[PDB]
mmCIF file of all heavy atoms in Angstrom:
data_model
loop_
_atom_site.group_PDB
_atom_site.id
_atom_site.type_symbol
_atom_site.label_atom_id
_atom_site.label_comp_id
_atom_site.label_asym_id
_atom_site.label_seq_id
_atom_site.Cartn_x
_atom_site.Cartn_y
_atom_site.Cartn_z
ATOM 1 N N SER A 235 -17.908 -7.346 18.762
ATOM 2 C CA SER A 235 -17.761 -6.681 17.466
ATOM 3 C C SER A 235 -18.953 -5.751 17.262
ATOM 4 O O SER A 235 -19.963 -6.139 16.670
ATOM 5 C CB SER A 235 -17.643 -7.702 16.338
ATOM 6 O OG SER A 235 -18.842 -8.447 16.198
ATOM 7 N N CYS A 236 -18.832 -4.519 17.757
ATOM 8 C CA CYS A 236 -19.833 -3.489 17.523
ATOM 9 C C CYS A 236 -19.251 -2.144 17.121
ATOM 10 O O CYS A 236 -20.015 -1.266 16.705
ATOM 11 C CB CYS A 236 -20.716 -3.295 18.766
ATOM 12 S SG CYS A 236 -22.078 -4.477 18.899
ATOM 13 N N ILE A 237 -17.940 -1.949 17.228
ATOM 14 C CA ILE A 237 -17.310 -0.700 16.816
ATOM 15 C C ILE A 237 -16.142 -1.017 15.888
ATOM 16 O O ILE A 237 -15.493 -2.062 16.042
ATOM 17 C CB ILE A 237 -16.869 0.127 18.035
ATOM 18 C CG1 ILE A 237 -15.849 -0.643 18.871
ATOM 19 C CG2 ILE A 237 -18.070 0.528 18.880
ATOM 20 C CD1 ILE A 237 -15.218 0.189 19.949
ATOM 21 N N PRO A 238 -15.849 -0.157 14.911
ATOM 22 C CA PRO A 238 -14.799 -0.475 13.935
ATOM 23 C C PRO A 238 -13.442 -0.649 14.594
ATOM 24 O O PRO A 238 -13.093 0.060 15.540
ATOM 25 C CB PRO A 238 -14.813 0.735 12.995
ATOM 26 C CG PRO A 238 -16.175 1.311 13.145
ATOM 27 C CD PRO A 238 -16.545 1.097 14.579
ATOM 28 N N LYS A 239 -12.673 -1.609 14.079
ATOM 29 C CA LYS A 239 -11.346 -1.862 14.627
ATOM 30 C C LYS A 239 -10.391 -0.720 14.315
ATOM 31 O O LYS A 239 -9.508 -0.415 15.126
ATOM 32 C CB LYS A 239 -10.801 -3.182 14.089
ATOM 33 C CG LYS A 239 -9.451 -3.567 14.652
ATOM 34 C CD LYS A 239 -9.538 -3.763 16.155
ATOM 35 C CE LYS A 239 -10.427 -4.944 16.502
ATOM 36 N NZ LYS A 239 -9.820 -6.236 16.080
ATOM 37 N N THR A 240 -10.545 -0.081 13.154
ATOM 38 C CA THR A 240 -9.731 1.092 12.852
ATOM 39 C C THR A 240 -10.110 2.270 13.743
ATOM 40 O O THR A 240 -9.241 3.051 14.149
ATOM 41 C CB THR A 240 -9.851 1.456 11.370
ATOM 42 O OG1 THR A 240 -8.996 2.569 11.077
ATOM 43 C CG2 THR A 240 -11.289 1.798 10.992
ATOM 44 N N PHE A 241 -11.400 2.420 14.059
ATOM 45 C CA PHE A 241 -11.809 3.445 15.013
ATOM 46 C C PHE A 241 -11.508 3.023 16.444
ATOM 47 O O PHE A 241 -11.364 3.877 17.324
ATOM 48 C CB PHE A 241 -13.293 3.767 14.850
ATOM 49 C CG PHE A 241 -13.627 4.461 13.559
ATOM 50 C CD1 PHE A 241 -14.940 4.561 13.132
ATOM 51 C CD2 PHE A 241 -12.630 5.026 12.779
ATOM 52 C CE1 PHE A 241 -15.253 5.200 11.947
ATOM 53 C CE2 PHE A 241 -12.936 5.666 11.593
ATOM 54 C CZ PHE A 241 -14.250 5.754 11.177
ATOM 55 N N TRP A 242 -11.432 1.717 16.696
ATOM 56 C CA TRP A 242 -10.905 1.236 17.967
ATOM 57 C C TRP A 242 -9.427 1.578 18.102
ATOM 58 O O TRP A 242 -8.959 1.946 19.187
ATOM 59 C CB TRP A 242 -11.131 -0.272 18.085
ATOM 60 C CG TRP A 242 -10.387 -0.928 19.200
ATOM 61 C CD1 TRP A 242 -9.065 -1.258 19.222
ATOM 62 C CD2 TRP A 242 -10.926 -1.355 20.452
ATOM 63 N NE1 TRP A 242 -8.745 -1.852 20.415
ATOM 64 C CE2 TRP A 242 -9.872 -1.923 21.188
ATOM 65 C CE3 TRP A 242 -12.198 -1.306 21.026
ATOM 66 C CZ2 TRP A 242 -10.051 -2.439 22.464
ATOM 67 C CZ3 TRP A 242 -12.371 -1.819 22.294
ATOM 68 C CH2 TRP A 242 -11.305 -2.380 22.999
ATOM 69 N N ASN A 243 -8.676 1.458 17.009
ATOM 70 C CA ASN A 243 -7.240 1.699 17.064
ATOM 71 C C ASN A 243 -6.913 3.179 17.206
ATOM 72 O O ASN A 243 -5.953 3.533 17.899
ATOM 73 C CB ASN A 243 -6.568 1.127 15.818
ATOM 74 C CG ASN A 243 -6.319 -0.364 15.924
ATOM 75 O OD1 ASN A 243 -6.913 -1.046 16.758
ATOM 76 N ND2 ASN A 243 -5.434 -0.878 15.078
ATOM 77 N N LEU A 244 -7.678 4.055 16.551
ATOM 78 C CA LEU A 244 -7.412 5.488 16.653
ATOM 79 C C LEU A 244 -7.593 5.975 18.083
ATOM 80 O O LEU A 244 -6.768 6.737 18.601
ATOM 81 C CB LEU A 244 -8.324 6.261 15.702
ATOM 82 C CG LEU A 244 -8.089 7.769 15.627
ATOM 83 C CD1 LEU A 244 -6.705 8.068 15.074
ATOM 84 C CD2 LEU A 244 -9.164 8.438 14.784
ATOM 85 N N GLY A 245 -8.673 5.547 18.738
ATOM 86 C CA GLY A 245 -8.848 5.871 20.144
ATOM 87 C C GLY A 245 -7.787 5.227 21.014
ATOM 88 O O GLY A 245 -7.369 5.798 22.025
ATOM 89 N N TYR A 246 -7.343 4.030 20.637
ATOM 90 C CA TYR A 246 -6.232 3.397 21.335
ATOM 91 C C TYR A 246 -4.974 4.248 21.238
ATOM 92 O O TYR A 246 -4.279 4.458 22.237
ATOM 93 C CB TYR A 246 -5.994 2.006 20.749
ATOM 94 C CG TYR A 246 -5.328 1.017 21.676
ATOM 95 C CD1 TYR A 246 -6.020 -0.085 22.148
ATOM 96 C CD2 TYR A 246 -4.013 1.178 22.069
ATOM 97 C CE1 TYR A 246 -5.422 -0.993 22.986
ATOM 98 C CE2 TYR A 246 -3.408 0.272 22.906
ATOM 99 C CZ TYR A 246 -4.119 -0.811 23.362
ATOM 100 O OH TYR A 246 -3.519 -1.717 24.202
ATOM 101 N N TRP A 247 -4.673 4.757 20.041
ATOM 102 C CA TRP A 247 -3.482 5.579 19.861
ATOM 103 C C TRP A 247 -3.654 6.946 20.507
ATOM 104 O O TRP A 247 -2.679 7.551 20.965
ATOM 105 C CB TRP A 247 -3.166 5.724 18.372
ATOM 106 C CG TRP A 247 -1.892 6.463 18.102
ATOM 107 C CD1 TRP A 247 -0.634 6.086 18.466
ATOM 108 C CD2 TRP A 247 -1.752 7.708 17.408
ATOM 109 N NE1 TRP A 247 0.282 7.017 18.045
ATOM 110 C CE2 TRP A 247 -0.379 8.025 17.391
ATOM 111 C CE3 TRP A 247 -2.654 8.588 16.800
ATOM 112 C CZ2 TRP A 247 0.114 9.181 16.790
ATOM 113 C CZ3 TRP A 247 -2.163 9.734 16.204
ATOM 114 C CH2 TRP A 247 -0.791 10.021 16.203
ATOM 115 N N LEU A 248 -4.889 7.447 20.550
ATOM 116 C CA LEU A 248 -5.155 8.746 21.152
ATOM 117 C C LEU A 248 -4.836 8.765 22.639
ATOM 118 O O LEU A 248 -4.611 9.841 23.203
ATOM 119 C CB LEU A 248 -6.619 9.122 20.920
ATOM 120 C CG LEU A 248 -7.064 10.561 21.148
ATOM 121 C CD1 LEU A 248 -6.365 11.488 20.174
ATOM 122 C CD2 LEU A 248 -8.567 10.663 20.994
ATOM 123 N N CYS A 249 -4.815 7.599 23.288
ATOM 124 C CA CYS A 249 -4.565 7.546 24.721
ATOM 125 C C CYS A 249 -3.099 7.783 25.053
ATOM 126 O O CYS A 249 -2.783 8.134 26.195
ATOM 127 C CB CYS A 249 -5.038 6.202 25.274
ATOM 128 S SG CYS A 249 -4.964 6.032 27.062
ATOM 129 N N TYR A 250 -2.201 7.612 24.086
ATOM 130 C CA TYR A 250 -0.788 7.890 24.290
ATOM 131 C C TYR A 250 -0.449 9.370 24.181
ATOM 132 O O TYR A 250 0.637 9.771 24.613
ATOM 133 C CB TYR A 250 0.072 7.132 23.271
ATOM 134 C CG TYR A 250 -0.117 5.632 23.215
ATOM 135 C CD1 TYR A 250 -1.055 5.061 22.368
ATOM 136 C CD2 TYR A 250 0.675 4.786 23.975
ATOM 137 C CE1 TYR A 250 -1.216 3.695 22.299
ATOM 138 C CE2 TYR A 250 0.520 3.418 23.912
ATOM 139 C CZ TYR A 250 -0.425 2.879 23.073
ATOM 140 O OH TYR A 250 -0.581 1.516 23.012
ATOM 141 N N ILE A 251 -1.338 10.186 23.609
ATOM 142 C CA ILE A 251 -1.000 11.575 23.330
ATOM 143 C C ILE A 251 -0.910 12.409 24.600
ATOM 144 O O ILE A 251 -0.337 13.504 24.577
ATOM 145 C CB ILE A 251 -2.014 12.186 22.345
ATOM 146 C CG1 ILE A 251 -2.424 11.156 21.293
ATOM 147 C CG2 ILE A 251 -1.425 13.404 21.655
ATOM 148 C CD1 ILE A 251 -1.302 10.728 20.379
ATOM 149 N N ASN A 252 -1.460 11.927 25.716
ATOM 150 C CA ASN A 252 -1.294 12.642 26.977
ATOM 151 C C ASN A 252 0.170 12.692 27.387
ATOM 152 O O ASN A 252 0.631 13.690 27.953
ATOM 153 C CB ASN A 252 -2.134 11.996 28.074
ATOM 154 C CG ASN A 252 -2.436 12.950 29.210
ATOM 155 O OD1 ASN A 252 -2.309 14.164 29.063
ATOM 156 N ND2 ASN A 252 -2.821 12.405 30.355
ATOM 157 N N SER A 253 0.917 11.621 27.113
ATOM 158 C CA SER A 253 2.351 11.636 27.373
ATOM 159 C C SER A 253 3.068 12.649 26.493
ATOM 160 O O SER A 253 4.114 13.180 26.883
ATOM 161 C CB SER A 253 2.932 10.242 27.160
ATOM 162 O OG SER A 253 4.329 10.238 27.373
ATOM 163 N N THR A 254 2.529 12.926 25.305
ATOM 164 C CA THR A 254 3.134 13.917 24.423
ATOM 165 C C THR A 254 2.954 15.327 24.970
ATOM 166 O O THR A 254 3.905 16.115 25.011
ATOM 167 C CB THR A 254 2.530 13.808 23.022
ATOM 168 O OG1 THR A 254 2.831 12.521 22.470
ATOM 169 C CG2 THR A 254 3.089 14.887 22.110
ATOM 170 N N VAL A 255 1.737 15.662 25.402
ATOM 171 C CA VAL A 255 1.433 17.032 25.808
ATOM 172 C C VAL A 255 1.792 17.329 27.252
ATOM 173 O O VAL A 255 1.756 18.498 27.653
ATOM 174 C CB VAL A 255 -0.059 17.350 25.602
ATOM 175 C CG1 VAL A 255 -0.485 16.998 24.188
ATOM 176 C CG2 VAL A 255 -0.905 16.610 26.620
ATOM 177 N N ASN A 256 2.128 16.315 28.048
ATOM 178 C CA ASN A 256 2.425 16.555 29.458
ATOM 179 C C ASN A 256 3.575 17.531 29.682
ATOM 180 O O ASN A 256 3.446 18.388 30.573
ATOM 181 C CB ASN A 256 2.694 15.224 30.168
ATOM 182 C CG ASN A 256 1.452 14.646 30.808
ATOM 183 O OD1 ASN A 256 0.349 15.154 30.615
ATOM 184 N ND2 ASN A 256 1.623 13.576 31.573
ATOM 185 N N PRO A 257 4.700 17.466 28.958
ATOM 186 C CA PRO A 257 5.740 18.489 29.161
ATOM 187 C C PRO A 257 5.260 19.905 28.897
ATOM 188 O O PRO A 257 5.692 20.833 29.589
ATOM 189 C CB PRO A 257 6.845 18.073 28.178
ATOM 190 C CG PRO A 257 6.195 17.129 27.225
ATOM 191 C CD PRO A 257 5.153 16.423 28.023
ATOM 192 N N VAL A 258 4.361 20.102 27.935
ATOM 193 C CA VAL A 258 3.847 21.433 27.631
ATOM 194 C C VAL A 258 2.536 21.635 28.378
ATOM 195 O O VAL A 258 1.716 22.484 28.009
ATOM 196 C CB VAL A 258 3.669 21.641 26.116
ATOM 197 C CG1 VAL A 258 5.023 21.663 25.423
ATOM 198 C CG2 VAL A 258 2.783 20.561 25.525
ATOM 199 N N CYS A 259 2.329 20.847 29.428
ATOM 200 C CA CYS A 259 1.140 20.925 30.260
ATOM 201 C C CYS A 259 1.438 21.139 31.734
ATOM 202 O O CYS A 259 0.644 21.789 32.419
ATOM 203 C CB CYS A 259 0.308 19.643 30.112
ATOM 204 S SG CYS A 259 -1.398 19.786 30.644
ATOM 205 N N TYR A 260 2.548 20.605 32.241
ATOM 206 C CA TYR A 260 2.892 20.726 33.651
ATOM 207 C C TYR A 260 4.317 21.236 33.818
ATOM 208 O O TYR A 260 4.640 21.873 34.825
ATOM 209 C CB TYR A 260 2.725 19.381 34.359
ATOM 210 C CG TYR A 260 1.305 19.077 34.770
ATOM 211 C CD1 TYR A 260 0.403 18.539 33.866
ATOM 212 C CD2 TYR A 260 0.867 19.330 36.061
ATOM 213 C CE1 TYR A 260 -0.894 18.263 34.232
ATOM 214 C CE2 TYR A 260 -0.431 19.055 36.439
ATOM 215 C CZ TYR A 260 -1.308 18.522 35.521
ATOM 216 O OH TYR A 260 -2.603 18.245 35.891
ATOM 217 N N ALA A 261 5.176 20.958 32.838
ATOM 218 C CA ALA A 261 6.570 21.386 32.902
ATOM 219 C C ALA A 261 6.760 22.761 32.269
ATOM 220 O O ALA A 261 7.195 23.702 32.937
ATOM 221 C CB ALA A 261 7.472 20.347 32.226
#
Side-chain angles (χ1 to χ4, degrees):
Chain A
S235 65
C236 277
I237 61 171
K239 183 62 65 68
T240 183
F241 292 166
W242 168 282
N243 279 18
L244 184 64
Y246 205 112
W247 185 63
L248 195 64
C249 186
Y250 305 90
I251 322 295
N252 202 17
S253 178
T254 297
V255 308
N256 267 8
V258 293
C259 198
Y260 278 83

